[PDB]
Structures are given as structure tokens and as C-alpha cells.
Amino acid sequence: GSHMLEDPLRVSPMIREFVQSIDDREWQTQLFALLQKQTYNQVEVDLFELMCKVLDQNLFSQVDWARNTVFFKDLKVDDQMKLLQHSWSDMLVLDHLHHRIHNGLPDETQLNNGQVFNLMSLGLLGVPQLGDYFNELQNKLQDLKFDMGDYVCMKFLILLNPSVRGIVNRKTVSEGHDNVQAALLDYTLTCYPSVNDKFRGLVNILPEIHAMAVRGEDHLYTKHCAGSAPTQTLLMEMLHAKR
Amino acid sequence: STLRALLTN
């Protein structure tokens, strides 16, 4: 139910459609697949680099998702690019927030290398120190009964942010953001009546999540400056954009 | 440009 919609009988079509666009399975599959491929038959690997590899892949998938999004369709690339550039970091955390809670993703895994990958890092973007903060959010979210439905709406909310510098077709973005908020509100009201101010509780998180993303992007960029990771990646390009 | 390529297609 957490990873599922609450009262499917009472859910809007829009939301159902949003949940359509998520294949959790593919995400986890893709994740371990890369991890296996990157590590089997290798004596040692740079764990930091690997995390980046995962993130790079995630980004591609992120882009793919947005692309097929109903709202993006009505958008020009320049505009889409700007939106994606703004919150890629933001989505990763939430996505991680989603898996950690909904799908029982663990903090670490044994690599078949005898090496251990900190999965948890993926959601901290390499800043270990944010774990308490990440956790605080995970707890807040759980108490709010964060569900699969909530998670998708929040993604759009994050993505479809009008107050983003340089976006030409502002109206469309505002409208979509505005719809989703409403849809989210409705869902909370109809399907989680018992949870008071759930809408606000969830909406309030986004700002918090963003703060985490910022630290994370900066660390990731700082690391790239040091020569720690490949420069040709989408991840770097994304990291680069705001500079 | 890579970003653009992906969404440009």
C-alpha cells in the first residue's frame, strides 16, 4: 500500500497515469546490473567512481522519464533542459527516498568482489554526513504515510518549477505544477483523511530535500575538480551547467 | 549538448 496506491477506486486518472510511468523494477534491475557488470572479474575498483557511474545512469533514466512526461511534451527543448538542469539532484534524493522506504533498498551491498558498495551514498550524493538529515526526512515522510502516489506528484512538483531562471514558456510549467499540486491535495484528502495536514507535510519537505541536494551537488562538483571522476559524462555536464 | 541530444530525439 505504501508502494501502492491507497484506494485505487478513489484515485484520479492523472495520478494513475503518473504511477504508470514508474517502473521500480527497471530501476533496481538497472542498478544491480551495472554494479555487477562493473565489478565482476575486477580485483579492485574505485568506489567513488562507481557511485558516479550509477548516478550517471540514473540521470539518463531521469531524462528519459521526463521526456515522456505529459507536460514536457508540450515543451521546447531549451525549456526542458533548463528544468532538468535545475533539479536533477533534487530528484535523485527523492527517488532514493522512495526506494529506501518503499522497496527496501539497503544501505550497502557486497559486491561479489568482496568489496562493499554504499548504496546509501547514492542518495547522499557522496556526503556521508547527510545521513542524519536524510534520515530525518525519511522519518518525517514515513509518519506521513508517504506512498507511491505521493512520490510521483512530488517529482513533478520538483521538476515542474516555474520560478526557474530563463524559462520561456512559463505558463505551461506553472499550470502543470499547479495541477499536480491540486491532484496531490485531492489524493491526500480522499485517500488519507486520517493524516492531518498531510499535504503540507509533504510539500514542506521539498525545500528540505533541496537543501540536501545542494550540499550534494557541491561536493560532487568539488570532487570532479579534483580529478576524481570522468569528465565526459552526463553527470559532469549536469554538474557543470550551473557555472 | 548530450543533454540536448537525448531530449532532442
UniProtKB/Swiss-Prot annotation, chain A:
Extent of the signal sequence: none
Primary location class: nucleus
Biological process terms in GO annotation: dendrite morphogenesis; hormone-mediated signaling pathway; imaginal disc-derived leg morphogenesis; instar larval or pupal development; juvenile hormone mediated signaling pathway; lipid homeostasis; metamorphosis; mushroom body development
GO MF term list: DNA binding; DNA-binding transcription activator activity, RNA polymerase II-specific; nuclear receptor activity; RNA polymerase II cis-regulatory region sequence-specific DNA binding; RNA polymerase II-specific DNA-binding transcription factor binding; transcription cis-regulatory region binding; zinc ion binding
Keywords: Activator, DNA-binding, Metal-binding, Nucleus, Receptor, Transcription, Transcription regulation, Zinc, Zinc-finger
Record function comment: Acts as a cofactor to fushi tarazu (ftz). Facilitates the binding of ftz to DNA. Binds the sequence element 5'-YCYYGGYCR-3' in the zebra element of ftz. Probably functions as a nuclear receptor for a yet unknown ligand. In contrast to vertebrate homologs, not activated by phospholipids.
Name of the protein: Nuclear hormone receptor FTZ-F1
Species per Swiss-Prot/TrEMBL record: Drosophila melanogaster
Name of encoding gene: ftz-f1
Residue numbers of the full-length protein present here: 790 to 1025 of 1027
Curated annotation (Swiss-Prot), chain B:
Record PTM text: Phosphorylated at as many as 16 sites.
Tissue: Expressed early in development in a striped pattern at the blastoderm stage. Later expressed in a specific subset of neuronal precursor cells, neurons and glia in the developing CNS. Between 5 and 6 hours of development, found in the midline precursor-2 cells in a segmentally repeating pattern. Expression in many other neuronal precursors follows and reaches a second peak of abundance at 9 hours of development. Expressed in the hindgut between 11-15 hours of development.
Note in the entry: 'Fushi tarazu' means 'segment deficient' in Japanese. Flies lacking ftz exhibit embryos with half the usual number of body segments.
Gene of this entry: ftz
Organism whose genome encodes this protein: Drosophila melanogaster
Subcellular compartments: Nucleus
Protein's name according to its UniProt entry: Segmentation protein fushi tarazu
Function as written in the Swiss-Prot or TrEMBL entry: May play a role in determining neuronal identity, may be directly involved in specifying identity of individual neurons. Required during embryogenesis for the process of body segmentation. Homeotic protein, required in alternating segment primordia, it specifies the correct number of segments.
Family according to the record: Belongs to the Antp homeobox family.
Source lineage: Eukaryota, Metazoa, Ecdysozoa, Arthropoda, Hexapoda
